Write an enzyme that holds these catalytic residues in place. Structure first.
Site, PDB file in Angstrom:
ATOM      1  N   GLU A  88       0.787  -1.257   0.000  1.00 19.39           N
ATOM      2  CA  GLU A  88       0.000   0.000   0.000  1.00 19.39           C
ATOM      3  C   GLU A  88       0.814   1.301   0.000  1.00 19.39           C
ATOM      4  OE1 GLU A  88      -2.906  -0.328   3.203  1.00 19.39           O
ATOM      5  OE2 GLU A  88      -3.759  -2.173   2.377  1.00 19.39           O
TER       6      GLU A  88
ATOM      7  N   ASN B  75       2.183  -5.320  -3.087  1.00 20.98           N
ATOM      8  CA  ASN B  75       0.751  -5.531  -2.864  1.00 20.98           C
ATOM      9  C   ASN B  75      -0.009  -4.215  -2.638  1.00 20.98           C
ATOM     10  OD1 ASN B  75      -1.447  -7.548  -2.470  1.00 20.98           O
ATOM     11  ND2 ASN B  75      -1.428  -6.860  -0.326  1.00 20.98           N
TER      12      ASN B  75
ATOM     13  N   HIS C 199     -10.611  -5.903  -2.942  1.00 20.88           N
ATOM     14  CA  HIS C 199     -11.701  -5.709  -1.986  1.00 20.88           C
ATOM     15  C   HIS C 199     -12.832  -4.981  -2.687  1.00 20.88           C
ATOM     16  CE1 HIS C 199      -9.387  -7.152   1.401  1.00 20.88           C
ATOM     17  NE2 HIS C 199      -8.400  -6.331   1.088  1.00 20.88           N
TER      18      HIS C 199
ATOM     19  N   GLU D 158      -6.424 -10.667  -1.610  1.00 23.97           N
ATOM     20  CA  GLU D 158      -7.314 -10.403  -0.477  1.00 23.97           C
ATOM     21  C   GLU D 158      -8.783 -10.326  -0.907  1.00 23.97           C
ATOM     22  OE1 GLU D 158      -5.810  -7.105   1.949  1.00 23.97           O
ATOM     23  OE2 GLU D 158      -3.725  -7.728   1.676  1.00 23.97           O
TER      24      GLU D 158
ATOM     25  N   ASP E 256     -12.473 -10.212  -1.502  1.00 23.98           N
ATOM     26  CA  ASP E 256     -13.817 -10.354  -0.936  1.00 23.98           C
ATOM     27  C   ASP E 256     -14.757  -9.427  -1.696  1.00 23.98           C
ATOM     28  OD1 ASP E 256     -12.926  -7.961   0.342  1.00 23.98           O
ATOM     29  OD2 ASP E 256     -12.678  -8.874   2.269  1.00 23.98           O
TER      30      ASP E 256
END
Ligand SMILES: [Mg+2]
Length: 302
Positions: free
Chosen positions: A127, A170, A206, A235, A237
């Site tokens: 990030e 990432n 996400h 990650e 979802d």
């Protein structure tokens, strides 16, 4: 390993889940994990404040429980995450540049040493870019004091320690081609042109009503793959329910399986029960570990 993991493995990919050490002793949580997944990511246990809360004093027990479980089940492990602006111990930020550099490299080196040869991929830096239209670097002790070069330095250190791990950058909100993913793209292209040791780009993915699966998701993954790196969905979802959620998962799995260097997908948790976005019920298993329509769609797409 696992139903989803083996289905993915048949086409050269992995399927993983974020795992919490504090739920591993729960029979249904462990049963679901072991029945379904072929890779794990420690949700919190390898973060800086979890492994080095006091300078040069390392606490690996919680993460070791996850890694030990993975190895016993033949599951891959993603290490998460070495250098990140978020949730740092209080003492990191006041360090002068030279001491921050030392502390950062020491952290990378000792954490990677403990897990040497046991880690499929590392989120080396997490990030580093701002949200929105700027494409600018996020303020952090690393960015502010070490400058633009801190990312390259972190990857170089990582490579000297464990040559067998894939080294990933990432980030989130990088799913379509946009100002943020463009900044990451520029960086990675530059890295590959100069022989900086980066092997992979992680896409957190996400998704929710404000950040939907973009129409160019596949093309974006492909352009990164074409730079000579693997892409990983790290990650995943997707907020929502029923057929709409299921169709969103289909979109994502299809996109990965259509890109030859998309090597795997990890969903951000085993069960809705323990999701960091629980009100969005965003995962493949409900609160009782029952398969959701989302699960059915993922399995059918693999
Ligand atoms: Mg199939």
């Amino acid at each position: 390993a696992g139903a989803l993991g083996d289905a993915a493995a048949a086409k050269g990919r992995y399927f993983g889940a974020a795992v919490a050490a504090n739920h591993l002793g729960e029979a249904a949580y462990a049963s679901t994990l072991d029945a379904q997944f072929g890779s794990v990511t420690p949700e919190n246990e390898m973060k800086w404040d979890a492994v080095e809360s006091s300078r040069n004093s390392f606490s690996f027990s919680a993460a070791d429980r996850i890694v030990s479980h993975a190895q016993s089940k033949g599951m891959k492990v993603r290490g998460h995450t070495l250098v990140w602006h978020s949730q740092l111990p209080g003492w990191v930020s006041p360090l002068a540049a030279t001491d921050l550099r030392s502390a950062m490299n020491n952290h990378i080196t000792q954490v990677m040493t403990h897990y040497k040869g046991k880690i499929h991929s590392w989120d080396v830096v997490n990030e580093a870019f701002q949200d929105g239209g700027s494409g600018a670097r996020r303020s952090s002790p690393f960015q502010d004091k070490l400058g633009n070069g801190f990312i390259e330095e972190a990857f170089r250190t990582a490579r000297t320690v464990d040559a067998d791990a894939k080294l990933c950058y990432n980030d989130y909100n990088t799913d379509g081609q946009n100002a943020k993913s463009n900044a990451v793209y520029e960086m990675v292209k530059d890295f590959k042109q100069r022989g900086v040791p980066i092997d992979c780009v992680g896409f957190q993915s996400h998704f929710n009503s404000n950040s939907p699966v973009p129409s160019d998701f596949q093309a974006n993954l492909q352009r990164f793959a074409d730079l000579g790196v693997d892409v990983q969905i790290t990650e995943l979802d997707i907020e929502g329910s029923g057929s709409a959620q299921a169709a969103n998962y289909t979109k994502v799995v299809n996109a990965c399986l259509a890109v030859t260097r998309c090597t795997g997908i990890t969903v951000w948790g085993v069960t809705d029960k323990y999701s960091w976005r629980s009100g969005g019920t965003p995962l493949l298993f409900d609160g009782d570990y029952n398969k959701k329509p989302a699960y059915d769609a993922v399995l059918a797409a693999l």
